[PDB]
Design a protein around this ligand. Structure first.
Ligand code: ZN
Ligand code: ZN
Lengths: 113, 114, 134, 707, 48, 176
């Protein structure tokens, strides 16, 4: 029990976490999280040669965001915390990184043409 | 002929000599990690510099719209009858008027001099 | 396998509060650190800078253990916030904000140096070898 | 739908569309409208406030206005001055300048009292005639004659004390790029250079060399190890080894340093060359002692230790490569670029890439009236803020109060610009010895073709008597952008030059919208990548700054070119180079590059079908012109750098016929090869039949013919 | 023809690529005369 | 320039006007006394005998190997001649240096100057000292190699960097 003491539990549990990049306007929508903090629902479809993840906004939060999965290779990532009681804790190791993007961002099609 | 990096501090391993078993040992000068040498040669200096640029030219040069083309010399590895040729365009230009070719067929990239 | 034919749907929440700030602790893969070898760790802000900005000092295994220095990344939410997504017993997902990015690197405890003496050393070396010439 | 052998009347109907819209002095009129809409608002907006002090005060500037040129009569009644009275009464054609200032007093006296004085007078700026801010903008010939003005007068000059002054475009070496030369007289065997300037915000431009000492250094010591890579940073006296300045940024280890400089460890020939660079820098093996080493020799030798470690901190942070980033964060970028600068110096020593050319016209930029008056306006706005303090402190120590309308010395900006323009020396009045002379000479009004040939003239700032021929001889890259025949004799042969008929100089834009597209098209940033995934990737530069990598360059290049073809998202004046061999991609957006239009060619046929001609000969009552021709992807502006990755055909009906042919992958085609001549050299009949020096004499002789 | 050989006569006229190379030759021939005068004048003044 | 290299005209004049130490192309014209002035072969031999020739002009490549014993012969095929020397073993006075230097020569550049490694072998010894020791092949073998070790009297400052210094010093200061 000391201030500079770091909890290693998460790591030693091999606890995994997911990492997702989110646009600010969506994140600004999320600061207005519905209810306790709910923002919506995540949908995951995996097939024999294709895997699809997306998130859909809460109907309340509204008043499809597909995910792009990103590699975490080349650099080991873990999450470590600082409590409001300044206690330190390692929650886990990052097992996934991702970046949701708005669907059909205008022309792209024109720039392909 | 290559180079050796330390396995602890990731630095350059120097060659050293031990007076016990007459074997080359590679040592570090930050830590003292050790190991023996497999080829037992250190320095080589090529003065002829007769490196054939067939090992330096890239296969995507056949996408250049400013290079001459030929219907005479076909490719051997694929049989395509269109090539694109050029000169050394590098140093060692004393007697350098050879003519390297590159096949223009997509996904062949075969290169050859003559 | 389920990674191929696997399907599912889970709820996502983003709580407006947390009991602890969330940061990222990044390691070079090239080191392939065995976290199992970490019996204990100490974690303190670096003392060279003599708080929230302070680089971290990580000391593995209490007394006898490894040591790393963590340096803060330039930005973390300059254009896009980073979230920690965690699976809950109810299957629903929980998202946690990333407060900061710290870069952790390994430290060389041996090989101490003093450039004052080494400056004179290089000059002497650049002199003795230059002498006794021809 | 194709145009067979009706070509001789078709090429002269698109050229007519060009000049009916652009004109001949759009060179001058477009750089001015830029300096006065954007480049002047940014200078006052990006200026440090003057917090000063007990209470303390605030002052910051918000918005700039202008009014139409006006003359104040003898009894103080204003009236708009027409350009003719300015010539008759020896007046000056200028416009007054205002600003909004807000003043908040901060004394924590339980209240923050703020107040503002909007539209405060500052000074007067000259106005280039026929601009968007002149009294003659957008008038019809019935009104131009009513003010006693000529409808054929081109415009593009100032009226200063009755006279008519014209600004000469000055040449200048390109910035934010790496050049490798070889001084065969001094101690160095090779040298690199990079002049950096952080987006039009710095009065100086910090330059940094990365040298390499000579091989034949007579001395048994250095005979065995070899040459040592050295660096000559700014604001320091002594040379510095590169490994030292590398460690001052962190990166003390020698496995991490030697991955910013060498991108693949299967190359023993290069690693052998960098080995004797560590031996002498195996001295400062930690950060703080390294900062002391460079911090020991500055403009001030530090007596204490903390000041040197402080002094070495910013000089390595705000004077080293300011174009990459000037913030104290993001110092991994200053390491990669400094590594690329050294990785490129070794390639020039192993003989794997050729040295750069000094006079290659793709390494030059041009300073029009825009980037010249903006440089002169900074040094006089700082000088106006430096003397509001001196008036505030003297006036606030007595603690009375403050009044700002009496602090602004209005004669600073008015007489500052008007002086240097009228006399030419590009400096200050007490600085009639430190300035660049020869700019801003008097317009030539001998004959109408001597007027046009004056508003289109370049000038290389090298000396006027140096006997070195290489800055005087004709470069081949001058094809189509500078007239080859027109030049004066005497001592100024080849130093002043006139630009060709269709040559167009760019005006500049912001790289913001391309960067936001690049990141969403699968471009890995520099930070979040491993230095081993860099050997088979094409480093992507933008405007001089390394901003990522990409494992699929060609599709991006064609897509970008295609986007540029419609200029759909890209200002049609950006150039996008891709060199297959060196495996990188460059993009430019700045001002000063010189362009010229060409005809885009698909597989082997032109993209200009007959449908474009029979509707282009009708511009009078159809509203279809040059602009609707660029926006349809049939012509395209081609810079000088981009002109090395292209394959041109001179004439359609003769070079694009399938046969036993020269080439078969033509990418562009010329409009008419007669547009490679200047203004005074395109009035000669059959000049393709004369000896060459004869065409030079007449072009310098039809400028003094009475008419 | 690709490196400077002009094969026409002044009566039959030159093609554009030949008109450019001719201009280059003329330009160098024009610079040398501009140098020569100053050089010779100064050296003669010294000697005399 | 329209005329190898000779300076004429007004720059040659002011090279004569002053007697500045630096002519832009100093050159001594030479004439030949005997039948050597008649036949091209003796002219060419005195030509080669006058021209300066260093070592790096007659070498193909060099390599620093490591033979702790002269019978180790790390490279595969040099064992024959080094061995036929080894059955006549001389100069094992103090030690045998484990560090070796191996040099390859180009007979093209060798014969054009009428050189063969015998004279080189004595002068690379006679002229530098006796700290070096040269054994060599027979020229009937196509490739001309000669191997050198330091004189072992020094082994009873590192010898590797010293050997690299000597290698980088002899190919430019040869004076053949
Ligand atoms: Zn080591
Ligand atoms: Zn093929």
């Amino acid at each position: 029990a000391e201030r500079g003491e770091l909890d290693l539990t998460g790591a030693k549990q091999n606890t995994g976490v997911w990492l997702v990049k989110v646009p600010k306007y969506l994140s600004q929508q999320w600061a207005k999280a519905s209810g306790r903090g709910e923002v919506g629902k995540l949908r995951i479809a995996k097939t024999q040669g294709r895997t699809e993840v997306s998130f859909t906004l809460n109907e309340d939060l509204a008043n499809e965001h597909p995910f792009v999965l990103q590699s975490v290779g080349g650099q080991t990532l873990t999450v470590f915390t600082e409590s409001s009681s300044d206690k330190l804790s390692l929650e886990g190791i990052v097992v996934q990184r991702a970046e949701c993007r708005p669907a059909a961002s205008e022309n792209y099609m024109r720039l392909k043409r | 002929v290559g180079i050796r990096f330390c396995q602890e501090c990731n630095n350059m391993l120097y060659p050293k000599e031990d007076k016990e078993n007459r074997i080359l040992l590679y040592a570090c000068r930050n830590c003292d990690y050790q190991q023996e040498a497999d080829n037992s040669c250190i320095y080589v200096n090529k003065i002829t510099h007769e490196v054939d640029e067939l090992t330096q030219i890239i296969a995507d040069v056949s996408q250049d719209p400013t290079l001459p083309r030929t219907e005479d010399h076909p490719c051997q590895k694929c049989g395509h009858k269109e090539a694109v040729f050029f000169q050394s365009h590098s140093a060692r230009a004393e007697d350098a008027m050879r003519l390297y070719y590159v096949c223009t067929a997509p996904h062949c990239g075969h290169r050859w001099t003559e | 396998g389920p990674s191929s034919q696997n399907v599912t749907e889970y709820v996502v929440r983003v709580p407006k509060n947390t009991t602890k700030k969330y940061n990222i602790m990044a390691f070079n893969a090239a080191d392939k650190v065995n976290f199992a070898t970490w019996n204990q760790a100490r974690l303190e802000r670096d003392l060279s800078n003599k708080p929230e900005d302070q680089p971290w000092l990580l000391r593995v295994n209490g007394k006898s253990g490894r040591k790393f220095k963590g340096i803060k990344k330039g930005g973390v939410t300059e254009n896009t916030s980073y979230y920690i997504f965690t699976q809950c017993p109810d299957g629903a997902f929980e998202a946690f904000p990333v407060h900061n990015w710290y870069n952790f690197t390994p430290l060389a405890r041996h090989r101490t140096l003093t450039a004052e003496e080494a400056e004179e050393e290089w000059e002497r070396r650049n002199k003795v070898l230059n002498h006794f010439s021809i | 739908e194709i145009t067979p052998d009706l070509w001789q009347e078709a090429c002269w109907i698109v050229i007519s569309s060009y000049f009916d819209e652009k004109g001949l002095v759009r060179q001058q009129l477009d750089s001015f409208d830029e300096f006065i809409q954007m480049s002047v608002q940014r200078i006052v907006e990006d200026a440090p406030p003057i917090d000063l002090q007990p209470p303390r005060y605030l002052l910051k500037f918000e918005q700039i206005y202008l009014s139409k040129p006006t003359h104040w009569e003898r009894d103080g009644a204003p009236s708009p001055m027409m350009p003719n009275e300015a010539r008759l009464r020896n007046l000056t054609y200028s416009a007054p300048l205002y600003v909004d200032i807000t003043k908040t007093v901060i004394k924590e006296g339980e209240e923050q009292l703020q107040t503002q004085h909007q539209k405060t007078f500052i000074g007067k700026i000259p106005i280039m005639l026929r601009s968007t801010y002149c009294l003659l903008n957008g008038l019809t010939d019935r009104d131009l004659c009513e003010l006693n003005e000529c409808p054929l007068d081109p415009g593009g000059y100032f009226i200063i004390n009755g006279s008519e002054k014209v600004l000469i475009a000055q040449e200048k070496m390109a910035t934010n790029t790496v050049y490798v030369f070889a001084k065969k007289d001094s101690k160095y065997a090779y040298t690199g250079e990079c002049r950096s300037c952080l987006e039009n915000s710095s009065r100086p431009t910090s330059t940094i060399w990365v040298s390499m000492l000579a091989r034949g250094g007579q001395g048994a010591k250095k005979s065995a190890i070899g040459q040592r890579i050295v660096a000559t940073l700014p604001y320091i006296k002594q040379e510095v080894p590169i490994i030292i300045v590398f460690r001052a940024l962190g990166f003390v280890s020698d496995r991490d340093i030697l991955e910013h400089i060498i991108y693949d460890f299967e190359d023993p020939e290069m690693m052998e060359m960098v080995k004797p660079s560590l031996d002498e820098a195996f001295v400062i093996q930690e950060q703080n002692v390294a900062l002391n080493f460079i911090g020991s020799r500055g403009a001030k030798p530090g007596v204490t230790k903390e000041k040197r470690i402080k002094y070495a901190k910013e000089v390595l942070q705000k004077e080293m490569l300011p174009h990459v980033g000037v913030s104290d964060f993001c110092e991994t970028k200053k390491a990669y670029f400094l590594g690329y600068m050294v990785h490129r110096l070794l390639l020039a020593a192993l003989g794997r890439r050729e040295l750069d050319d000094r006079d290659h016209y793709g390494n030059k930029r041009l300073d029009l009236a825009g980037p010249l008056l903006a440089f002169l306006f900074r040094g006089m706005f700082k000088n106006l803020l430096k003397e509001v303090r001196i008036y505030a402190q003297k006036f606030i120590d007595r603690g009375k109060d403050f009044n700002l309308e009496l602090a602004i010395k209005t004669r600073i900006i008015s007489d500052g610009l008007k002086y240097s323009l009228a006399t030419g020396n590009w400096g200050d009045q007490k600085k009639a010895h430190q300035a660049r002379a020869g700019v801003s000479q008097v317009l030539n009004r001998l004959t109408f073709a001597s007027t046009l040939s004056h508003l289109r003239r370049l000038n290389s700032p090298i000396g006027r008597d140096g006997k070195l021929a290489k800055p005087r001889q004709l470069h081949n890259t001058l094809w189509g952008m500078v007239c080859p025949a027109e030049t004066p004799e005497g001592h100024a042969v080849g130093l002043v030059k006139n630009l060709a008929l269709m040559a167009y100089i760019s005006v500049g834009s912001q790289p913001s919208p391309i960067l936001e597209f690049l990141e969403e098209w699968s471009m890995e940033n520099l930070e979040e990548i491993s230095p081993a995934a860099i050997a088979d990737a094409t480093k992507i530069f933008v405007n001089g700054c390394w901003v990522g990598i990409h494992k699929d360059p060609e599709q991006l290049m064609n897509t970008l070119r295609k986007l540029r073809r419609q200029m759909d998202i890209i200002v049609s004046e950006v150039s996008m180079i891709r060199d297959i061999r060196e495996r990188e991609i460059r993009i430019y957006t700045d001002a000063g590059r010189i362009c010229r239009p060409l005809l885009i060619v698909e597989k082997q046929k032109l993209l200009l079908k007959k449908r474009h001609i029979d509707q282009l000969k009708e511009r009078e009552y159809n509203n279809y012109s040059w602009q609707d021709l660029v926006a349809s992807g049939v012509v395209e502006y081609i810079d000088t750098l981009e002109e090395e990755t292209v394959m041109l055909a001179m004439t359609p009906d003769d070079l694009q016929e399938k046969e036993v042919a020269y080439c078969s992958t033509y990418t562009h085609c010329e409009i008419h090869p007669s547009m490679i001549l200047g203004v005074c050299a395109s009035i000669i009949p059959f000049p393709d039949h004369n000896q060459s020096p004869r065409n030079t004499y007449q072009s310098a002789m039809g400028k003094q013919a009475m008419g | 023809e690709s490196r400077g050989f002009v094969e026409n006569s002044y009566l039959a006229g030159l093609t554009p690529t030949e008109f450019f190379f001719h201009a280059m030759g003329g330009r160098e021939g024009l610079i040398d005369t501009a140098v020569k005068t100053a050089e010779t004048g100064y050296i003669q003044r010294r000697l005399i | 320039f329209h005329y190898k290299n000779v300076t004429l005209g007004v720059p040659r004049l002011k090279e004569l006007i002053n007697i500045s130490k630096k002519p832009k192309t100093p050159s001594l014209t030479v004439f030949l006394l005997g039948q050597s002035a008649r036949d091209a072969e003796r002219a060419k031999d005195i030509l080669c005998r006058l021209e300066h020739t260093t070592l790096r002009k007659v070498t193909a490549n060099t390599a620093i190997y490591y033979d702790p014993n002269p019978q180790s012969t790390v490279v595969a095929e040099d064992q024959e001649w080094v061995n036929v020397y080894y059955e006549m073993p001389d100069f094992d006075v103090a030690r045998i240096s484990p560090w070796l230097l191996r040099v390859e020569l180009d007979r093209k550049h060798m014969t054009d100057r009428k050189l063969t490694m015998e004279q080189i072998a004595e002068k690379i010894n006679a002229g530098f000292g006796d700290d070096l020791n040269c054994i060599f092949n027979d020229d009937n073998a196509e490739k001309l190699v000669l191997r050198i070790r330091i004189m072992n009297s020094d082994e009873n400052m590192d010898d590797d960097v010293f050997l690299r210094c000597i290698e980088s010093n002899m190919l430019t200061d040869m004076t053949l």
